[PDB]
């Protein structure tokens, strides 16, 4: 889960390289988008979508396996200074009515750094982010230009646990270079129902292992030699992608001037054609 | 990463005619070529 990150590497989730802790555990392999406007203005509430693929057609296992509902989570680095829009503003509900969930910071304080407790599911695949823009004049500690924006979005069950041991959405391997002569699949009374196994490796010490409930299966005996490697089946569908970006804040009196400058060129490169040939009926006189 | 710039592509490329035209249009006014 998002939180999980700050429960181990809380100073920040973004690794020095460019990846977020998410994969140092719950590892997946799906797409992900995080697009927002080219330029946003200071002291302004604006958009920020976080699309999350996979056709809703999907339906993963669950904690107990029972093929069911799917869930979507994430994390995001907004630019230093950028915070979550103020209730009052958030111009009309036209905004409000899209993203209505809990956005908590990471380390206590970082408002530009936001996680999303609320994991809507096959509901909020847009996970919109109402975000306000800082004012770098009310605070000289805030500067302009482009600024980075990074994101690491998840989904599907974990493959690794914060406890420190294998999850469900994944595979359960083994250890034995020799044809496994049997099995051990069964069940349990109440909250449990295990599916053990019995390798062989008669080649010396006949070793075996313990695969749990969850993953389906495949073939059986007469072989299954190889070298005692992978398991029977893998359920994982975990989805974790990642997209980086950047947005610009613009000093209007800085866009004006640049524009006020055009019109000069706009006129200049004109009078410059105005004269010239547009007044050469001179040599075109003899 | 396509969409965004992708429109800026054909974007400009169009403007190439956008002006090119006028450039000429300003001609059917002061003595260029016919039509």
């Amino acid at each position: 889960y998002p939180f999980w990150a700050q429960q181990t590497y809380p100073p920040t989730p973004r690794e020095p390289t460019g990846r977020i802790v998410c994969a140092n555990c719950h590892l997946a392999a799906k797409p992900a988008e995080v697009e927002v406007p080219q330029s946003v203005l200071p002291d302004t509430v604006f958009k920020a979508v976080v699309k999350i693929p996979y056709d809703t057609k999907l339906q993963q296992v669950a904690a107990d396996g029972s093929k069911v509902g799917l869930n979507v989570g994430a994390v995001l680095m907004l630019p230093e200074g950028f915070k979550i829009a103020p209730e009052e503003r958030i111009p009309e509900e036209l905004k409000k009515e899209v993203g209505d969930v809990y956005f908590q910071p990471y380390k206590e304080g970082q408002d530009n750094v936001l996680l999303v407790g609320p994991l809507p599911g096959e509901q909020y695949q847009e996970i919109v982010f109402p975000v306000l823009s800082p004012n770098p004049t009310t605070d000289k500690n805030i500067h302009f230009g482009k600024y980075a924006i990074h994101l690491g979005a998840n989904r599907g069950r974990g493959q690794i646990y914060p406890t420190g041991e294998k999850s469900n959405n994944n595979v359960f391997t083994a250890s034995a270079t020799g044809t496994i002569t049997k099995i051990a699949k069964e069940e349990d009374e109440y909250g449990n129902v295990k599916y053990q196994v019995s390798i062989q490796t008669d080649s010396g010490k006949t070793v075996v292992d313990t695969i749990p409930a969850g993953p389906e299966l495949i073939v059986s005996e007469g072989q299954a030699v190889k070298a005692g490697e992978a398991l029977t089946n893998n359920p994982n569908v975990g989805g974790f992608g990642q997209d980086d970006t950047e947005i610009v804040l613009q000093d209007p009196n800085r866009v004006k001037w640049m524009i006020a400058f055009i019109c000069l060129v706009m006129l200049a490169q004109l009078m410059l054609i105005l004269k010239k040939k547009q007044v050469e009926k001179v040599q075109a006189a003899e | 990463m396509t969409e965004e710039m992708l429109y800026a592509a054909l974007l400009s490329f169009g403007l190439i005619f956008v002006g090119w035209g006028l450039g000429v249009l300003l001609l059917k006014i002061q003595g260029a070529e016919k039509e």
């Binding site: 019109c263 706009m266 006129l267 004109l270 105005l274 | 006014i29 002061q30």
Partner: peptide
């Protein structure tokens, strides 16, 4: 989206000074 609702503007607006200027000396 509108954009042209602008090019058509600004753009032509300087054009609307261009064709005008000859009218001053040529005419």
């Amino acid at each position: 989206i509108d954009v042209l609702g602008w090019v058509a503007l600004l753009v032509v607006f300087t054009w609307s000074i261009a064709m005008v200027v000859w009218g001053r000396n040529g005419l």
